[PDB]
Design a protein around this ligand. Structure first.
Ligand code: HEM
Ligand code: HEM
Ligand code: HEM
Ligand code: HEM
Lengths: 141, 146, 141, 146
């Protein structure tokens, strides 16, 4: 889905996010790896330690991919075409992991923007992230 | 539940700060708003047509409070989380027929609400401690589905 | 997602289904109600018994809605616009029930078309049904 | 596991006919094809890049057979399905780290495969008996996640 309303919220929260986008994407993974250790299985060649610059640079990666989504939210599929391949085909990431990632992303959003992280915005973020996830796992589908 | 001394200290130190009056409602509210299907369960709660109407419903905040209790209950009963929740499980299991996955949602939204209220103080490590408890409770809950 | 392949499959199996479409839609619900009795909660004014003509007529309803999807698979959203409202908004159906239904739908498909219910087709049907369900519950999203 | 006399008669009567050589592979095969993420676990199985390559893999049909065993095992041990599966749970839980939900899918696809092989003989009622069993196994399996 994603309503004209959702669309508004997602573009709002992110507007808010700004340049810390990358900073947040990394916090997200970090949170993920600690709370969901099983996910750690995909980054075996990664230094998953606290200040790992590896995880640091990946966060930007993810973060930027999410930025690409927001700006092209009305065309995610075509937008994330490449990423779906990597994740579904090449990586074969268990769809469940997207639920775990999205969670930490939310948690991160919440931990930093108490002002903008309204119940309504929260919902639109969750909706948006599920869209992203669906496409990124759409090759399974 | 395991919760290392470190983890325990993290969990305990946080819940200590938790505004029990308003966090349970904050979390229950958010569950209804984020997972709207779950609202089929609180039809006798009143107007839940808008998140505003949801976040300012006295029943919601009233109910959200009992929910945190059970959590306070469990948080200090990790030993026998299944013991503690037998009765509750029964209510939600073969009385409410609430799909156990909803148990997880709640848990997670509770995690966001906490993260919401504590900001930076809700570090990854504390989060992970909380992820453990939250899932223990949700597992204690859907126990009666066996 | 739903690939040019998926799309081919869905259209193929259904072509195969024919006039029995409605016949199967009802077998599907029946199977659902017996296997997942919690679902029965939504049809309290329905005679959920074996030969229930109520269940009978609903099956065609569901069946026709699935046919509408197939033919408009490239625009499910707009197609099931109405149905998403009914189910998400007005009925507030637990998303989980869609997983339960689709399962029974598959099970019915399989019990009737052993010839066309290939592992490849099975996958495409599953994918398709997930699509329909996501739309039918996208007002929650 | 409850399975009424009638249900049991249904279950038993069915499994009796079940081609143990080829159903397990049929179901394991379909799992990899339908839920391709699941293939991350059988990388050492060989060529699984096409459904055909999947359905005609000797290790898949080789493996699919042990899986039915566990089921024959359980099917006739509904009394203590957790007892029967402790070792298996252990392998999949903290050895394979297979998300419990895949336990469910396998079960489901097992249902379709049966449905597929028995046709009309796989009535709703027998299906329901099987849904009970399949979920019991899946729950016995994810037991060590506690
Ligand atoms: C919104 C959700 C996600 C987004 C936007 C995302 C985005 C990305 C991006 C942009 C890349 C690198 C692409 C490049 O080469 O530029 C990547 C790689 C990767 N992703 Fe994700 N990802 C998401 C979720 C996940 C999840 C849930 C997992 C599994 C736990 C995962 C596992 C991986 C792995 C293992 C890599 C490759 C790392 C490497 O070898 O460099 N991703 N992802
Ligand atoms: C960890 C998760 C949960 C906990 C700890 C919890 C706790 C509770 C508590 C303490 C009560 C009321 C006790 C009393 O009547 O004395 C309750 C009742 C209820 N629960 Fe939950 N709950 C959880 C999840 C859920 C979910 C996911 C739903 C589904 C929407 C749900 C639906 C309800 C409803 C509708 C009632 C009201 C019962 C009535 O008044 O008839 N709960 N739960
Ligand atoms: C993707 C699969 C499904 C399709 C295509 C579908 C389609 C339909 C259609 C076409 C109607 C009739 C609407 C009207 O003309 O007024 C309907 C009604 C309904 N559906 Fe479904 N449905 C699906 C899944 C489900 C599930 C999983 C449930 C939950 C058990 C459900 C519960 C209901 C209920 C309770 C009604 C209203 C019946 C009445 O009060 O007359 N549906 N659905
Ligand atoms: C009904 C659910 C399941 C049952 C009854 C089952 C049964 C079994 C059995 C009987 C074995 C080997 C027995 C032996 O070595 O003596 C096994 C191993 C294995 N299972 Fe499953 N399984 C189930 C679900 C799954 C799922 C969902 C996955 C994930 C895709 C999975 C992945 C594996 C793998 C990869 C092995 C091989 C372990 C090794 O040889 O190192 N299983 N399972």
């Amino acid at each position: 889905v994603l309503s004209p309303a959702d669309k508004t919220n997602v573009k709002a929260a992110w507007g808010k996010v700004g340049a810390h986008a990358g900073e947040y994407g990394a916090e997200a993974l970090e949170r993920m790896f600690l709370s969901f250790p099983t996910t750690k299985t995909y980054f075996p060649h990664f230094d998953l330690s606290h200040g790992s610059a590896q995880v640091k640079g990946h966060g930007k990666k993810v973060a930027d991919a999410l930025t690409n989504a927001v700006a092209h939210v009305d065309d995610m599929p075509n937008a994330l075409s490449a990423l779906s391949d990597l994740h579904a085909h090449k990586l074969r990431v268990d769809p469940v992991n997207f639920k775990l990632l999205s969670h930490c992303l939310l948690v991160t959003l919440a931990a930093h923007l108490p002002a903008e992280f309204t119940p309504a915005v929260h919902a639109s973020l969750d909706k948006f992230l599920a869209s992203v996830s669906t496409v990124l796992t759409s090759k399974y589908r | 539940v395991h919760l290392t001394p470190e983890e325990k200290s993290a969990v305990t130190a946080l819940w200590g700060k938790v505004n029990v009056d308003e966090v349970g409602g904050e979390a229950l509210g958010r569950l209804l708003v984020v997972y709207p299907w779950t609202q089929r369960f609180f039809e006798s709660f009143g107007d839940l047509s808008t998140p505003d109407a949801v976040m300012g419903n006295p029943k919601v905040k009233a109910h959200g409070k009992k929910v945190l209790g059970a959590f306070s209950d469990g948080l200090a009963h990790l030993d026998n989380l299944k013991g503690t929740f037998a009765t509750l499980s029964e209510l939600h299991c073969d009385k409410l027929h609430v799909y156990p996955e909803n148990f997880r949602l709640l848990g997670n939204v509770l995690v966001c609400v906490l993260a919401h209220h504590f900001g930076k103080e809700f570090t990854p490590p504390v989060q992970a401690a909380y992820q453990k408890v939250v899932a223990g409770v949700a597992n204690a809950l859907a126990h009666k589905y066996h």
